[PDB]
Amino acid sequence: RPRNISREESLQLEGYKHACHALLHAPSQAKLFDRVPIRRVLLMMMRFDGRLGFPGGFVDTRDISLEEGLKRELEEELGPALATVEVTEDDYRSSQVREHPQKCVTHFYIKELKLEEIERIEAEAVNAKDHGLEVMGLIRVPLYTLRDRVGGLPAFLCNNFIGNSKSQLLYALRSLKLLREDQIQEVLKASHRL
Amino acid sequence: PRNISREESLQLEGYKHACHALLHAPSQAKLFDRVPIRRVLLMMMRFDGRLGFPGGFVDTRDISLEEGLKRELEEELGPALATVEVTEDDYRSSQVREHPQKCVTHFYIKELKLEEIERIEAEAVNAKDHGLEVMGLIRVPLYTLRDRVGGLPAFLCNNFIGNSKSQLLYALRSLKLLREDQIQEVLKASHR
Ligand SMILES: [Mn+2]
Ligand SMILES: [Mn+2]
Ligand SMILES: [Mn+2]
Ligand SMILES: [Mn+2]
Numbered sequence: 001r002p003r004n005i006s007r008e009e010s011l012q013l014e015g016y017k018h019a020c021h022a023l024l025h026a027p028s029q030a031k032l033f034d035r036v037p038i039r040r041v042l043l044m045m046m047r048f049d050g051r052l053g054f055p056g057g058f059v060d061t062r063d064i065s066l067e068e069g070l071k072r073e074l075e076e077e078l079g080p081a082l083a084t085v086e087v088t089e090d091d092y093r094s095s096q097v098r099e100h101p102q103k104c105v106t107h108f109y110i111k112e113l114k115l116e117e118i119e120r121i122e123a124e125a126v127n128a129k130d131h132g133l134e135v136m137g138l139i140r141v142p143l144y145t146l147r148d149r150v151g152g153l154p155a156f157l158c159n160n161f162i163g164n165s166k167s168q169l170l171y172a173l174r175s176l177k178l179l180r181e182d183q184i185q186e187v188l189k190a191s192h193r194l
Numbered sequence: 195p196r197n198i199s200r201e202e203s204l205q206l207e208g209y210k211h212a213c214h215a216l217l218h219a220p221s222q223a224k225l226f227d228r229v230p231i232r233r234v235l236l237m238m239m240r241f242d243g244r245l246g247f248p249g250g251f252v253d254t255r256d257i258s259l260e261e262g263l264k265r266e267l268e269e270e271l272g273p274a275l276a277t278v279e280v281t282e283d284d285y286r287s288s289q290v291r292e293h294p295q296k297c298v299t300h301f302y303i304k305e306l307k308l309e310e311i312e313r314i315e316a317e318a319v320n321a322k323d324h325g326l327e328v329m330g331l332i333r334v335p336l337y338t339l340r341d342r343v344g345g346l347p348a349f350l351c352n353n354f355i356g357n358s359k360s361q362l363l364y365a366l367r368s369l370k371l372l373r374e375d376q377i378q379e380v381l382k383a384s385h386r
Contacts, residue, residue, distance in 0.1 A: 032241055032326050041325065046239075046332040048225055049339060050349030122330075123319045126312070132234065133225050137315075137332030139239040140325060146242060156243025158353040 020070035021056035079128035154190035213263035214249035272321035
């Protein structure tokens with residue numbers, strides 16, 4: 001149902017509800033089992049509704065800017081550590097629009113941090129206003145495929161994702177150059193053997 | 195997957211052993227000041243992309259099923275755990291499979307104080323296994339939302355390792371959190 005739309009065009013519409021979500025990420029030299037390289041830490045979360053999503057939430061664009069709304073949502077959900085860390089217009093990536101079930105536009109941001117910054121974010125998430133309520137926990141996204149050819153990313157893609165968050169994740173994998181187009185197809189295939 | 199006994203368990207030959215625990219605490223918190231959380235139940239995202247309970251393998255002949263579990267927990271949840279009891283009284287059940295080379299997993303349910311769960315979550319990011327075997331802790335939503343889908347039923351549509359779903363369901367019956375009919379209602383809501 002979701003369709004692409006430019007930021008600028010989408011900011012012009014009327015009586016549309018807006019949401020902002022961010023992928024925070026950082027490179028890692030860690031190797032799982034000292035063999036399988038982690039490569040990069042991507043944060044997602046388990047939401048109060050039983051589903052996985054990226055942090056963020058609604059913004060009222062007549063009151064505050066998209067970035068200001070995003071900063072506030074992250075503070076609630078991810079905690080104090082998000083202060084001084086500034087997701088800006090540069091971090092903006094894409095906008096999608098729908099009408100079923102509600103007139104609704106979601107914006108997706110992608111921001112690289114230093115590893116210790118992600119770690120400090122994890123360490124302090126348990127202190128967020130939303131911890132154990134709207135946010136049920138923070139999780140890192142496995143980017144590897146294991147030898148059984150299912151465990152890791154393919155298996156993880158069989159989890160339950162809110163809205164278009166799965167599709168956003170896949171976008172980021174292709175944009176941060178982490179997987180080739182075919183690799184993504186391979187991942188969706190290995191996943192879909194239910 | 196077939197239910198078995200502790201009695202037998204330790205005596206079978208050629209099987210690999212695994213221990214897992216549900217740590218849980220009561221809670222007075224209300225989501226949107228409306229929906230009661232009731233209880234906090236810990237699970238995790240594994241390195242394999244699946245949800246499960248903390249723990250792992252333990253050499254049967256080396257030390258007791260508790261000694262293996264308590265080590266596994268400390269390794270996966272962090273230092274805080276060295277002061278968790280995890281006695282025999284916390285033992286719960288043992289299922290036996292013949293899939294990925296004959297497994298036997300034992301399930302443990304143990305009640306803690308909310309503070310204790312909170313301090314565990316707070317130190318989990320320090321566990322030897324953080325960012326490796328354990329990719330993050332999560333609380334299990336026990337409520338069902340107004341849409342009659344979000345909350346627990348949606349949660350059960352996630353990808354679960356081994357029989358950690360069976361185990362979770364058992365806990366909800368065992369801990370008197372849900373009746374059999376109510377469990378049967380979330381499953382139908384979920385698998386729809
Ligand atoms: Mn959110
Ligand atoms: Mn929010
Ligand atoms: Mn909030
Ligand atoms: Mn271990």
